[PDB]
Amino acid sequence: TGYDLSNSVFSPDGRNFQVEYAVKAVENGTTSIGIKCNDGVVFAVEKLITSKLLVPQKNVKIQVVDRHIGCVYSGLIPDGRHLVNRGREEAASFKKLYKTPIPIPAFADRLGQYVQAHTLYNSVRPFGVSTIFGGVDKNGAHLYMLEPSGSYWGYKGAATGKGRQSAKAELEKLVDHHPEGLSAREAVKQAAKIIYLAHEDNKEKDFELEISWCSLSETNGLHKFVKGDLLQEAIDFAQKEIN
Amino acid sequence: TQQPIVTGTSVISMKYDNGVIIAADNLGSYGSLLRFNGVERLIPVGDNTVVGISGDISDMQHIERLLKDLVTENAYDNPLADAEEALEPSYIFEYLATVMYQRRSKMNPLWNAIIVAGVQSNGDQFLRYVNLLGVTYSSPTLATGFGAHMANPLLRKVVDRESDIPKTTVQVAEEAIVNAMRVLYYRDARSSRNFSLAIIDKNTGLTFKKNLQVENMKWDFAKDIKGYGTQKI
Numbered sequence: 001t002g003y004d005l006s007n008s009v010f011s012p013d014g015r016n017f018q019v020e021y022a023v024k025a026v027e028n029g030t031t032s033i034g035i036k037c038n039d040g041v042v043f044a045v046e047k048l049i050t051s052k053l054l055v056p057q058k059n060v061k062i063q064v065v066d067r068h069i070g071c072v073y074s075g076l077i078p079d080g081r082h083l084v085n086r087g088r089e090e091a092a093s094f095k096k097l098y099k100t101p102i103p104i105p106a107f108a109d110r111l112g113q114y115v116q117a118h119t120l121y122n123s124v125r126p127f128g129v130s131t132i133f134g135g136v137d138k139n140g141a142h143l144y145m146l147e148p149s150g151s152y153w154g155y156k157g158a159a160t161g162k163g164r165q166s167a168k169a170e171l172e173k174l175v176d177h178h179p180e181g182l183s184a185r186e187a188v189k190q191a192a193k194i195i196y197l198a199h200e201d202n203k204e205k206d207f208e209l210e211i212s213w214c215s216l217s218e219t220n221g222l223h224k225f226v227k228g229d230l231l232q233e234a235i236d237f238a239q240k241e242i243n
Numbered sequence: 244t245q246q247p248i249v250t251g252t253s254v255i256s257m258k259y260d261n262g263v264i265i266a267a268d269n270l271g272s273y274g275s276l277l278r279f280n281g282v283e284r285l286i287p288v289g290d291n292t293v294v295g296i297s298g299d300i301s302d303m304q305h306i307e308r309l310l311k312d313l314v315t316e317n318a319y320d321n322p323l324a325d326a327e328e329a330l331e332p333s334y335i336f337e338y339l340a341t342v343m344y345q346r347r348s349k350m351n352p353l354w355n356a357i358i359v360a361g362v363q364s365n366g367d368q369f370l371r372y373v374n375l376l377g378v379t380y381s382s383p384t385l386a387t388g389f390g391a392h393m394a395n396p397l398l399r400k401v402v403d404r405e406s407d408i409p410k411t412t413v414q415v416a417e418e419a420i421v422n423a424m425r426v427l428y429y430r431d432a433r434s435s436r437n438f439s440l441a442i443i444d445k446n447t448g449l450t451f452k453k454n455l456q457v458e459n460m461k462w463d464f465a466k467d468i469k470g471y472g473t474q475k476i
Contacts, residue, residue, distance in 0.1 A: 060322055067315060088319065092312065225322070 006122045018126055019119055022075075022148035025128035029074035031163035031198040032061075034132040035171070036143040036156050037187040040215030041134040043072045044191035046163065046199060047208040062212045062225070066091040066101055069135040070212050070223045074161030076128035083131060086114055104135055104142035108152055116150025130160040135214040136221040163198030170194045184215035188226055192234035193241050209235060247299040247354040249273055251284045252433045253390030254295035254358050255423055257398045258368045258383050259416035260409050262444035265295045265360040266420050268427075270435040277435065283453075285439045286310060290449045291361050292332045293441040294339070297387040298355035298375070306339070306353065313338065332361030332369035344377025352376070356387035366445040368408070383408060389431040394423040413442065425457045 003009050004017035011017055032045040045061050063071045063084045071087065073080035090110040094102040102110075111131065118124050126148045134143040145158040157171030174182060174190060182190070191211055199207055211226040211234060213219060226234065249271045256265040271279035284303065286294050288310050296303045313335070318324040336359040346352050352375040361369045371381045383405065384398035401419045402411055420440065427434050436457045442450040469476060 057322075060320070063320060064318060067318065092315075096308075 007118075007124065007126060008120055008122050016119055016149070019149050022126040022128045023130075026075040026130045026148065026160060027162065027164075029076070029129075029161045030202065031159070031161040031167060031195060032072045032074045032132055033160075033167050033171070033191060033194055033198075034072070034134060034143045034145065034155065034158040035174070035182070035187045035191055035194075036134070036141055037184045037215065038141075038181045039217050040136050040141045040184050040187075040213060040219070040221070041070065041143045042184070042187040042191045042211065042213045043070045043132065043134075044195050044209070044211045045072050045074075046161070046195050046202060047210055048202060048205050049208055050205065056208065060210070060225075062210060064223045065107070065133070066095065067222050068101055068137070068214060069104065069107060069133060070214055071131060071133040072212075073129040073131040075130060079127050080129040080131060083111060083115070083127060083129065087111055087133075090114075101137070103137040103139070104144065105154075108133070108142075108144045108146070111146055112150050112152045114150075115146060115148065119148075119150060132158045132160060135223060136216055141214075141216075159194075159198075163201040166201060167194050167198045170197055184213060184218045188213060188230065188234050189237045192238035196238040196242055209238070244350055245354065247302075249278065249300040250433070251282065251297045251300055251303065252431055253386060253388045253394065253427055254284065254297045254356070255386040255390040255394040255398070255420060255427075256295065256358050256360050256370060256384065257402060257416055257420065258370055258408050259402075259411045259413055261413065261446055262362050262442065263360040263368050263370050264413075264416050264420050264440065264442050265293050265358060266424055266438060266440040267295050267297070268424070268435045268438040270433070270437075271300050272433045275432075277433075280435065280437070283439060285441050285451070287441065287449060287451060288314065288335050289330050291363075291443060292330065292335050292369075293360050293443060293449070293451075294335065295358045295360065295387075295441075296355055297357075299353070302353040302355050306355065306357070309339075309342070310335065327364075331363055332359055333363060335359055335361075336369070336371050336373070340373045340377065340379050343373050343375065347375060347377050358385050358387065360441070360443060362443050362445050389427060389434075390423070393426055393430060397423050397426065413444065417442065421455075425460065428457045429460075 003011040007018040030046040035042045065087045071084050091102045115127050118126050131146045143155045146152040156175050159167035214223045254267040267284040271282040286307050317330050321328050354375050356374040358372050372385050373379045383402040384395050386394040438455050440452045
């Protein structure tokens with residue numbers, strides 16, 4: 001024993017226990033999801049209202065990379081911000097050299113290789129976040145989810161944090177019941193419902209819903225936050241489905 | 244240290260009662276060769292600012308990318324990026340002025356003269372110049388290159404001091420700019436007939452006009468000019 005005390009050490013299993021411990025920080029965080037739709041992607045997150053003293057709509061969690069990529073994460077919030085800052089530098093150097101905005105699969109590997117590098121040495125700690133991200137590029141819509149190990153795949157729907165099992169079940173129903181696909185406006189409504197349903201795992205404190213989206217038709221392939229009437233319409237739809 | 248290769252000539256501008264106007268022709272010269280005839284030298288930043296650039300075109304394209312990247316960066320973690328925390332003309336200018344002076348101080352300048360025209364949050368007109376040396380100044384009219392020598396005299400007849408700005412309408416100001424562009428086409432050997440013009444108004448916003456031409460030209464008196472003194476036919 002002692003194999004779990006230092007990052008980058010293989011245990012006799014062939015496991016890196018420090019990475020598995022980082023996953024526990026992710027499992028402890030609030031719920032966040034992603035839904036791939038017909039011509040884009042939708043992101044949503046659970047924000048716990050710790051106190052009445054929190055200013056509504058101000059502590060924004062979802063982050064934009066370049067102008068076409070959205071990023072959301074569960075776990076240690078500062079570690080997520082560090083990863084997005086790097087993502088922004090990677091997207092900038094890609095656009096500087098190659099002119100075109102970074103494709104989503106290209107961007108996914110840039111984050112993936114950087115997270116993976118923080119499992120190679122004992123002088124650094126792994127990332128304590130799982131990050132759901134994506135957007136629209138020349139080849140269409142793409143949704144990804146990236147783990148503390150550096151592992152990532154493409155997704156039809158993605159979920160992480162404390163309510164992930166609840167969310168994953170709901171996402172699996174949408175995939176079965178909509179093989180031809182889901183619209184962007186539908187995906188916003190469904191994203192609200194899934195966060196509300198996933199809130200049963202964090203049910204002590206009340207919460208605030210936050211949604212964003214990239215869609216070729218609805219946002220010209222740019223990342224935007226869902227605000228005002230369209231946000232309230234999604235909240236009302238979510239409130240109706242739980243009752 | 245370098246030398247400019249592909250170049251753009253005059254950028255001209257002025258304040259009027261409710262905003263600012265700026266203009267520049269669509270040419271990229273290669274010395275005396277009038278090489279590129281479709282070059283846009285007015286570059287808008289948001290809906291409140293237009294940066295007009297003369298001098299080296301390779302350095303202009305670099306600056307264009309810096310400004311494009313500045314908008315991207317301002318949007319990051321900024322819920323008020325299209326409202327109270329949007330980029331202002333004054334912010335865009337100071338950034339460019341910092342870069343210009345830093346580059347001259349490393350003996351590797353961006354070989355340009357730049358005019359930032361826009362309208363601020365409070366409705367105030369913004370118009371300020373910066374060049375390859377980092378020299379900056381503001382005035383009710385501003386112009387680069389040949390425009391300094393020929394356009395400013397004409398534009399100063401409309402707005403000679405600060406107190407003339409409220410008295411000047413957008414029609415009068417645009418007329419003065421269009422005439423100045425004609426005078427430059429008569430007299431600047433590295434100019435073109437085709438140009439772009441931009442109006443930034445506090446009420447009506449950003450109006451960007453492409454593919455304008457110098458018109459109502461006087462050449463008829465040329466038929467009566469013969470020889471260089473004694474020749475009668």
